[PDB]
Design an enzyme around this catalytic site. Sequence first.
Site, mmCIF file in Angstrom:
data_model
loop_
_atom_site.group_PDB
_atom_site.id
_atom_site.type_symbol
_atom_site.label_atom_id
_atom_site.label_comp_id
_atom_site.label_asym_id
_atom_site.label_seq_id
_atom_site.Cartn_x
_atom_site.Cartn_y
_atom_site.Cartn_z
ATOM 1 N N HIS A 27 -10.391 3.426 -6.120
ATOM 2 C CA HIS A 27 -10.403 4.299 -4.949
ATOM 3 C C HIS A 27 -11.669 5.130 -4.992
ATOM 4 O O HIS A 27 -12.001 5.652 -6.061
ATOM 5 C CB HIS A 27 -9.173 5.230 -4.972
ATOM 6 C CG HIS A 27 -8.908 5.881 -3.654
ATOM 7 N ND1 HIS A 27 -9.732 6.880 -3.159
ATOM 8 C CD2 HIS A 27 -7.908 5.659 -2.774
ATOM 9 C CE1 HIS A 27 -9.222 7.216 -1.977
ATOM 10 N NE2 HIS A 27 -8.119 6.503 -1.704
ATOM 11 N N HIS A 38 -9.261 15.974 4.633
ATOM 12 C CA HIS A 38 -10.473 16.304 3.881
ATOM 13 C C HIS A 38 -10.966 17.748 4.102
ATOM 14 O O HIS A 38 -11.956 18.147 3.478
ATOM 15 C CB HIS A 38 -11.585 15.284 4.191
ATOM 16 C CG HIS A 38 -11.260 13.887 3.757
ATOM 17 N ND1 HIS A 38 -10.531 13.034 4.565
ATOM 18 C CD2 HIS A 38 -11.581 13.241 2.613
ATOM 19 C CE1 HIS A 38 -10.429 11.901 3.889
ATOM 20 N NE2 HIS A 38 -11.045 11.977 2.709
ATOM 21 N N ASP A 52 0.257 2.502 3.818
ATOM 22 C CA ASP A 52 -0.598 3.573 3.263
ATOM 23 C C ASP A 52 0.299 4.816 3.344
ATOM 24 O O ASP A 52 -0.043 5.829 3.948
ATOM 25 C CB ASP A 52 -1.897 3.799 4.069
ATOM 26 C CG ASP A 52 -3.000 4.360 3.214
ATOM 27 O OD1 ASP A 52 -2.695 4.889 2.142
ATOM 28 O OD2 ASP A 52 -4.177 4.299 3.642
ATOM 29 N N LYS A 97 -5.919 0.047 -8.833
ATOM 30 C CA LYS A 97 -6.512 0.462 -7.574
ATOM 31 C C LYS A 97 -7.872 1.094 -7.877
ATOM 32 O O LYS A 97 -7.956 2.002 -8.705
ATOM 33 C CB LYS A 97 -5.578 1.559 -6.947
ATOM 34 C CG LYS A 97 -6.242 2.319 -5.773
ATOM 35 C CD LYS A 97 -6.468 1.363 -4.580
ATOM 36 C CE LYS A 97 -6.890 2.128 -3.287
ATOM 37 N NZ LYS A 97 -5.806 3.086 -2.873
ATOM 38 N N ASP A 103 -12.119 8.154 -4.117
ATOM 39 C CA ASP A 103 -11.865 9.529 -4.563
ATOM 40 C C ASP A 103 -11.958 9.679 -6.082
ATOM 41 O O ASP A 103 -12.110 10.798 -6.552
ATOM 42 C CB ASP A 103 -10.530 10.077 -4.024
ATOM 43 C CG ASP A 103 -10.470 10.236 -2.501
ATOM 44 O OD1 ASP A 103 -11.420 9.769 -1.797
ATOM 45 O OD2 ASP A 103 -9.447 10.742 -2.005
ATOM 46 N N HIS A 139 -10.518 0.485 -2.250
ATOM 47 C CA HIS A 139 -10.856 1.452 -1.204
ATOM 48 C C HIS A 139 -12.297 1.823 -1.597
ATOM 49 O O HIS A 139 -12.518 2.529 -2.602
ATOM 50 C CB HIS A 139 -9.903 2.654 -1.210
ATOM 51 C CG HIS A 139 -10.318 3.800 -0.330
ATOM 52 N ND1 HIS A 139 -9.374 4.563 0.315
ATOM 53 C CD2 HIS A 139 -11.547 4.359 -0.120
ATOM 54 C CE1 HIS A 139 -10.032 5.545 0.912
ATOM 55 N NE2 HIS A 139 -11.351 5.456 0.695
ATOM 56 N N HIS A 159 1.962 4.870 -1.516
ATOM 57 C CA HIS A 159 1.611 6.029 -2.329
ATOM 58 C C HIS A 159 2.966 6.607 -2.743
ATOM 59 O O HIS A 159 3.749 6.992 -1.855
ATOM 60 C CB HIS A 159 0.864 7.089 -1.503
ATOM 61 C CG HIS A 159 -0.531 6.676 -1.168
ATOM 62 N ND1 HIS A 159 -1.625 7.333 -1.704
ATOM 63 C CD2 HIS A 159 -0.965 5.706 -0.335
ATOM 64 C CE1 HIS A 159 -2.692 6.721 -1.200
ATOM 65 N NE2 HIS A 159 -2.341 5.735 -0.375
ATOM 66 N N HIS A 175 0.830 -1.196 0.000
ATOM 67 C CA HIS A 175 0.000 0.000 0.000
ATOM 68 C C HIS A 175 0.872 1.257 0.000
ATOM 69 O O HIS A 175 0.826 2.082 0.916
ATOM 70 C CB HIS A 175 -0.994 0.009 1.172
ATOM 71 C CG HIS A 175 -2.125 0.974 0.994
ATOM 72 N ND1 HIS A 175 -3.393 0.662 1.444
ATOM 73 C CD2 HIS A 175 -2.156 2.201 0.416
ATOM 74 C CE1 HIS A 175 -4.147 1.725 1.162
ATOM 75 N NE2 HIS A 175 -3.442 2.672 0.534
ATOM 76 N N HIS A 231 -6.990 -1.403 3.977
ATOM 77 C CA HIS A 231 -7.491 -0.851 5.242
ATOM 78 C C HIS A 231 -8.895 -1.327 5.555
ATOM 79 O O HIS A 231 -9.823 -0.530 5.649
ATOM 80 C CB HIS A 231 -7.359 0.701 5.284
ATOM 81 C CG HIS A 231 -7.757 1.400 4.010
ATOM 82 N ND1 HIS A 231 -9.051 1.316 3.500
ATOM 83 C CD2 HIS A 231 -7.016 2.184 3.191
ATOM 84 C CE1 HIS A 231 -9.034 2.016 2.371
ATOM 85 N NE2 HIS A 231 -7.831 2.548 2.143
ATOM 86 N N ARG A 258 -15.831 7.727 9.747
ATOM 87 C CA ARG A 258 -14.709 6.826 9.464
ATOM 88 C C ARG A 258 -13.904 6.396 10.686
ATOM 89 O O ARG A 258 -13.217 5.382 10.608
ATOM 90 C CB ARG A 258 -13.765 7.422 8.425
ATOM 91 C CG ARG A 258 -14.140 6.980 7.031
ATOM 92 C CD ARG A 258 -13.488 7.816 5.978
ATOM 93 N NE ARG A 258 -12.061 7.528 5.843
ATOM 94 C CZ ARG A 258 -11.331 7.903 4.802
ATOM 95 N NH1 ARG A 258 -11.899 8.511 3.768
ATOM 96 N NH2 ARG A 258 -10.035 7.641 4.769
HETATM 97 NI NI NI Z 1 -7.483 4.177 0.927
HETATM 98 NI NI NI Z 2 -3.862 4.738 0.524
#
Ligand code: NI
Ligand code: NI
Lengths: 101, 566, 566, 566, 100, 100
Positions: free
Chosen positions: B218, B319, B359, B216, B220, B245, B135, B133, B271, B335
């Site tokens: 996600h 966020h 992550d 992935k 978003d 995700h 980024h 995971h 996650h 969350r």
């Molecule tokens: Ni995520």
């Molecule tokens: Ni992530």
Amino acid sequence: MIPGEYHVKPGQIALNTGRATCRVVVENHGDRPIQVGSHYHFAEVNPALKFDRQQAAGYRLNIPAGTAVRFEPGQKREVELVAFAGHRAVFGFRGEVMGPL
Amino acid sequence: SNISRQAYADMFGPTVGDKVRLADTELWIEVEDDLTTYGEEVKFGGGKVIRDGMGQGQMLAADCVDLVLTNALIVDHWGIVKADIGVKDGRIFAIGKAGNPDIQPNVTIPIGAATEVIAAEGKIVTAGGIDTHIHWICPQQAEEALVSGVTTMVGGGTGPAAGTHATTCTPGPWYISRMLQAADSLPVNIGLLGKGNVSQPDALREQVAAGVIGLKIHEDWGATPAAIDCALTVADEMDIQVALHSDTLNESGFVEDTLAAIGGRTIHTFHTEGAGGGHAPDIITACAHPNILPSSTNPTLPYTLNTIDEHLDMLMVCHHLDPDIAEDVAFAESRIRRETIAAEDVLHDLGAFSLTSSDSQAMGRVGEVILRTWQVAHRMKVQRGALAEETGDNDNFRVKRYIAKYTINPALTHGIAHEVGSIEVGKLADLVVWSPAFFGVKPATVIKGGMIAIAPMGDINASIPTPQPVHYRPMFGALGSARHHCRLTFLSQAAAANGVAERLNLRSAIAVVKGCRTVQKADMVHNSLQPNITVDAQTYEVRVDGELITSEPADVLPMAQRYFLF
Amino acid sequence: SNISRQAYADMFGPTVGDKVRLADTELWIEVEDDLTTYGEEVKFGGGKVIRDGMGQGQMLAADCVDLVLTNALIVDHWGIVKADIGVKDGRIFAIGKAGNPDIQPNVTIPIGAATEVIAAEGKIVTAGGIDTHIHWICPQQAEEALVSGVTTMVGGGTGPAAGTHATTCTPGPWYISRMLQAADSLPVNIGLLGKGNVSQPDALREQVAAGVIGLKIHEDWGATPAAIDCALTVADEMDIQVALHSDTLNESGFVEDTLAAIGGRTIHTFHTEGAGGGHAPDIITACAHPNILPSSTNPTLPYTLNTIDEHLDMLMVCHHLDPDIAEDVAFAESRIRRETIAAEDVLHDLGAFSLTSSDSQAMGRVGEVILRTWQVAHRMKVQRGALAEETGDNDNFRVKRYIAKYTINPALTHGIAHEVGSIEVGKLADLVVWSPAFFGVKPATVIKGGMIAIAPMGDINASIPTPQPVHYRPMFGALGSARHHCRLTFLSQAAAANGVAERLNLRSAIAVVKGCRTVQKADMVHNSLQPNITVDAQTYEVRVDGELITSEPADVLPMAQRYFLF
Amino acid sequence: SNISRQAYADMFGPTVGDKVRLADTELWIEVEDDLTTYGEEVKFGGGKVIRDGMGQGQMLAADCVDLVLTNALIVDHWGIVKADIGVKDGRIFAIGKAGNPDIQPNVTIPIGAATEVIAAEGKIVTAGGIDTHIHWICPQQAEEALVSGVTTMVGGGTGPAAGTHATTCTPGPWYISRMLQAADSLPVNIGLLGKGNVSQPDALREQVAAGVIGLKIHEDWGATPAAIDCALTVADEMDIQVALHSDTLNESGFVEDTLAAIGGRTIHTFHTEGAGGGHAPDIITACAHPNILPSSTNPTLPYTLNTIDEHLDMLMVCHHLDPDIAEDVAFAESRIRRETIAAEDVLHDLGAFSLTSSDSQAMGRVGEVILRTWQVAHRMKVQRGALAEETGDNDNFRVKRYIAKYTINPALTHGIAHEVGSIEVGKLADLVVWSPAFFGVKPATVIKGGMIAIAPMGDINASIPTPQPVHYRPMFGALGSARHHCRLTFLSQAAAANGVAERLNLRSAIAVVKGCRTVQKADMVHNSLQPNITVDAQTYEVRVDGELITSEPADVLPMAQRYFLF
Amino acid sequence: MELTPREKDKLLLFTAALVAERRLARGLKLNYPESVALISAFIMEGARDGKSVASLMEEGRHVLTREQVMEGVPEMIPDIQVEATFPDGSKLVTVHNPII
Amino acid sequence: MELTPREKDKLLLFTAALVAERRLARGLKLNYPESVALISAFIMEGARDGKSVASLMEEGRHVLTREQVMEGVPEMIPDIQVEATFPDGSKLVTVHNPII
Ligand code: NI
Ligand code: NI
Ligand code: NI
Ligand code: NI
Ligand code: NI
Ligand code: NI
């Protein structure tokens, strides 16, 4: 609490079990110290060490691996030897064998 | 000839029946077996065993190993054993007894003129970790992960851009090509993930053909049932993995709607506890399913007194929510849940969650995958006692269950277990050497494909390598062309077939992913539990067979203030 | 549906008619136009616009951009406008409105699965700077310039050798070849200058054929009329630029003799004010001529209370003069003049001086080209008020005039404006993102050819990229093969034709200079003034049409102590 | 026209008969000759000599040098002379008089448009040092050695592994190949040593064919008569050198048995004094033999008040002996002897020991080979006065004798003197520029193959390169492809013939070793003494022709606390 | 010490705070980097002492006041974030509007 | 100053010791890296003062006691080694069992 500490099981470990052994009396006739490692071919040690070399052919010191026996000048001692295993082929040392036996 | 067990352990490291404490934890490992012949141990140094005609033989390079790790205490999913390890052509050659067959018995690892020696007596050796995971926010993450004991990094990104700050996605052929080129410069094995969120399959096939080993999905980028179905259809065609995700907002459906869209196809749920993202409040129920490979990210591992406080103000910055608006506070309590964070630790102990991961810099700490895995194992031993699978007066089974979470299980999940993930013959020699006092925290040596890549190193001008300051510095396995020979870039089968490595002039060794679609929860080593889990929609309480699953937060942890300067 | 303008600016950045202060200066920009459709703005994040089927479409990679910068406030020579920016294949694709044509109106920048996002709402985006007076004293100058917002460096040198300490010259084919090879390692676009001082044209043609894009004539190698004529004759044949540091000593003639030797041919006069070098005391009169492209170097920008004191003791160390000898004090009062230093600031404000540059580590500061350009604009606004060209209650025209000095004007002068120098379609995507509070001082992101090359980055092991310490660290666009794809090495037409790139095995993308001989003062964007300027031989007073041109020294400047640790 | 000698020395550096103190030592050099024509010296700068038509000519690049070092004071084995130095195509072109033959007399070094200038007036120029006892424990050693003035490193290793911590051995074809690949990344010339300890010649031939230029016989791998004979037989066949660390334990024989096994064949004895290893207590007697090239490692140089104390507790950590066991204390008093350490300094002064070296991070300090060589020369001048070979009121001969120890003698010993080791026409331009106040301690410029590779450099953003902080930073000669062009990887003749450079895709220039077997003690420049030396087996006293050889330990040394921050 | 990259990185932050501490002691109004370094270093030492994340989120707002910093510095710092090793491992401290 | 790499490396060790010195002054029990840095820096300053290697091998055992460090820290440090420029050049100081 000690980080990474050991909890060793009490007792003893028997080394080189089931192998042929012999004892030889060795004397350092040189004027400088001689130290011999656990796996050195005993019959090919420094010529200043006097002992029965025929009896030592194909043997090494019967001591923990990586340890040594020291002979100060004039020092005499009885050592215990253990036979080599595997192919029983000796190469290196003083170049006296360079083959099987 | 006899030696005391205490003197033996000091010279050669522990043997059968001896126990070792892992760092400053309450975890104890017991040596299960020892492959040596007592008295025939190999030791290197002045006047020692590994010398011409003695522990070193007359064989040519083809007939001996390039590197031997002497007297290692191996900790891996299959055993905790004392043995010598042989490495040849950058790969693991044998686990056994090293030396010279001319004068020593039972030799399976021949040492010759062509052999280098690493003295592992009194050390623990493990496989290199695998973090799935990542980024790719910055390249500095590679050295940070490598120093921690992680040798393979799977993830996505293009640098510090909004898309990458939020998601593990390397979007499109151009960025995929540039990141594969940049990967040659980093001393870790790498595989990339593409952007899986699209409802037109050809936009996904293009990315896989460019070189990604997975996609992935996600939220978003819109984690809708149509995008999930599209990505899984392509994954089934091209033998790549999908990481998910899910829709935290329940905008497109609830967790059961996402699970229906998956339709029993293989998927890696990131996650899975949900703080890192996913259907609120019940994404954790995904671990009941046979086709789901569930991982945790690390800030929720283990549950501590400061976990929520950092998480409640982490989500408020990530966020840009602000505590003044009531609907944003209702989203913060959506969350971040004490109930699922506390349950997650137990689900790891039971083997219901199978992998750990970071992550990285996106609700996760890149240098803490390994350290936090062991802190969870410690907190579970303290709270729950021995596992039902445990034999003897030791924590061997719990240790095997937890090490699998960051080694073999991520490798199986991502279709790379034929190359890495464990200390097994034929695999790449990515190995980590640890002093027991620093196990899981600060390694003694990190080996990449048979060469030391990074290690603690003292004053360069000193008469020996031990004087202060000692800090981690890159070694020869991290330099130029030697680095290229010692690391892997993983590609999809389509990209390898299409000559992507030749077109981009990639310099590193290449490996191909396979077996991504056939892996299931039952294949997760020591972590195959499918519990009958429920989450109460109102209270968020987690139950397994109607029994409440909870744990207490730690006030103090091991592998923390005793070791770090800040 | 309506939103207040204050709430709109907080979510999407300012729109038409809103004003923004540049850093801590007195300069205000006003948004001139906004290319969006209100309500259709693209925003990335959890539950936001850029998601599958919404702001992101179904198109294949060939039909969408690789990167979108959302809601950018562009500041460039042609306008101060709010727009989305699209980048494709490392180049600027469009300035317009991004999104998904399937559901949104007026989309000119399609976003698809292959698109990465940079969130530019509330940020200012500019082209990368171009410094044309680099002394290659050390390679560390490249990272220093890049962090400041400069993405192209033109200059000469071989390292810290006497010749390079004094002059921007890379002497001869062997050093030119070695420096072109070294240039592949640096994350900036580079063009080299050869040694122009010779009276045999073949010794110059050899250097141009080896790869230089221009020739520097420096007085330290003899800036005589014969050497000037020789270099210009070769420049006219080979379409390269000549940069001049004239005869301060008036040994070969006075300024009028140098101007006669130039004979109306195109030339770039470095440090035209003269402290950096040139006919004492009147080299500044060169800005009256149509064939002269005049630049300033930066220690004299703007005129401050400490300028002379640092300059009088700078020249005393550089040339080893000592204040005891009267003839050396007469020489100190010869290059350093309060009168020309004070006039230079005004001549920049009027558009008579067209470029700014550093003179890196050779009477100039490599990380301060941009910062000092804005400090001059601020000091001129404070002393002189609005420019005659100014419309509205803002400083938009002054801002356009000054940004041109380090972007498009150096690019036009050096024959590279077809590739870089402005935010225009088809040009290389070298872009700098700034928070308004740090405009001109510390950028948020530096993009090189479509990849982020350097950026401020927080703790590598942190759960997010923002925690302390935050400092500039190289990104993926600065690494190995990705760096080679994202930077340009500029060559002369002769070198490109002769296969220099293949012979030297240059790895970076190559571009060729053209149009060096046809550019004139009238082509300098917003800086084309040819004043009727005179310098009094006795008092050094500068006059334009008989009117004294002067300014007052600053005691305090913006973009200084509020921002820097030392 | 006349100038005072004091004003002349300030402008151009010293001339014939002037003396210079070396750093803060008691050593004085006297200029022996000056190749200039008084009044025709070349000087670069504003209004100086090297300008078009003056000191710079009209010649094409093929007819002038690429680089001139002006007014250098050369210190080399053959003389201490004032001259200009010309470099062309990365090699030394001429030592003589630079300028323009059109207007100047006696020019042998033509300066043209293609020539760069390094101003060496008031500086000392020497060849780059050659350290032949490197343990490749970490790559950071290369920059440390380069900063100290060492430009060639010969040694062995694979990184921080037990084998390399103890021995200079790169074991086997796989590690040899990987280290040759890693060598392209380092800014020093490199040659590798293989593991010589084997009694089967084919296991050695394999290593030489893979690329090693020599074989190390180390007692930690068994320095037995059979292994010594085997390695020398192969060395005689393949024209490579053998380096020896003999049997300290006297396990296989005494020093006379090792010498009989060598049988008059050429060999390099490392750390011949013996603290670094070798037959106890008499390995030092090897310097009497014509076929032995003897070197010292540096912690015993010179003998000081703290030498033993650091050495007695150095050996106790290296071999893990502990002061409690009497047999380990008898072993501590076996390699560490006041008598041989004190004698070694004198044997260097007499020319009986021929080379100095480090033994990097393995009982030796990589950045101190040069500094310690000069500290021994100083302590010997103080204790013994002038050498018998000394002419004049200066230390010129002692200086020539000592500089040879780390320049030409290591080059001759390792078969690389055709490429490096001295300032002679045709050799690689590896040159070090020193200010006299910092001679041997901190160089002003380090040139690798004609390009500056490392130098002290001040603030990157400053207006000049001199402002603080000044610290060593890599230059263009250390970057990527320019580095590859400016360094050499040395290979054996067998490896070069077999296409090893093409197979491994080595990027650097390649050179081949030759003449390793024919070099003898009589060939050691100024250090050819074969003394009739004896060591008393009981007291360890060293005698030459029955006379006791001893020296007093220093309490304070020059080149120490005046210069270093720690 | 076996310092990891993250430990070495925090040494840079500690050193920058020493620069700021000495200037504040002289009575200077601190600038942007000085203010960030000083508040960040305070938080790292609070974590070493064993203070909670919640306590430091509040205590971090009382290190510097508007009168001790240059004009515009409070507005340039909407928040400060730093991680450190607490007794219970690494945690993130976010201090909102630290200078009032 | 013309700082060499080894001089710059020692600046890192000096800075880590400053962190430890300040924590010891607050009354904290020191951890593993803090203890190593503090004892090492003491030795470097002793070399600068002109103390002998033999004196520092002994004096280095009296900088920190078992009561000033965390549990297990003495056992994690069997020895400390550091080199510095003495009046007679660089020397290695090895301190055996420094914390008792
Ligand atoms: Ni995520
Ligand atoms: Ni992530
Ligand atoms: Ni100039
Ligand atoms: Ni200049
Ligand atoms: Ni040795
Ligand atoms: Ni050695």
